[PDB]
Ligand binder design. Structure first.
Ligand code: CL
Ligand code: CL
Ligand code: CL
Ligand code: NA
Ligand code: NA
Length: 129
């Protein structure tokens, strides 16, 4: 599913991301924009052989099982395919664990490089939320 911007904002807010770990909703919308282009089916293969999955590009080295990331863990207790679903509950729930791991949203390189320190509000402009 390719979410609209406000559509994704509303879903993330329902699922309790707004201000989770102190990160405003716009941070999460911005991260999803640059990570997945709002596409739940986004997949990216990393140099280390792991893969990123879904709207928030959750990585198989630590967070989900894809059966092909040697030495990896599955800390969210899900198949990485769960993360490609049109429904974002699994992605949002795993994201809560990742952002809680110690470095906040810096866990998403694209957030650090593209969203962090920017006017992340803008991402929820116009949304009736
Ligand atoms: Cl915001
Ligand atoms: Cl594996
Ligand atoms: Cl933080
Ligand atoms: Na990524
Ligand atoms: Na894994």
């Amino acid at each position: 599913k390719v979410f609209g911007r406000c559509e994704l904002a509303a879903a993330m807010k329902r699922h309790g991301l707004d201000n989770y770990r102190g990160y405003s909703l716009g941070n999460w919308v911005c991260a999803a924009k640059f990570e997945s282009n709002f596409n739940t089916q986004a997949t990216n293969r990393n140099t280390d052989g792991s893969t990123d999955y879904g709207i928030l590009q959750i990585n198989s080295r630590w967070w989900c099982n894809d059966g092909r990331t040697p030495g990896s863990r599955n800390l969210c207790n899900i198949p990485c395919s769960a993360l490609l679903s049109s429904d974002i509950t699994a992605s949002v729930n795993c994201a809560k664990k990742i952002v809680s791991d110690g470095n906040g949203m810096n866990a998403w390189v694209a957030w650090r490089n593209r969203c962090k320190g920017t006017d992340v509000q803008a991402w929820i402009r116009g949304c009736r939320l």
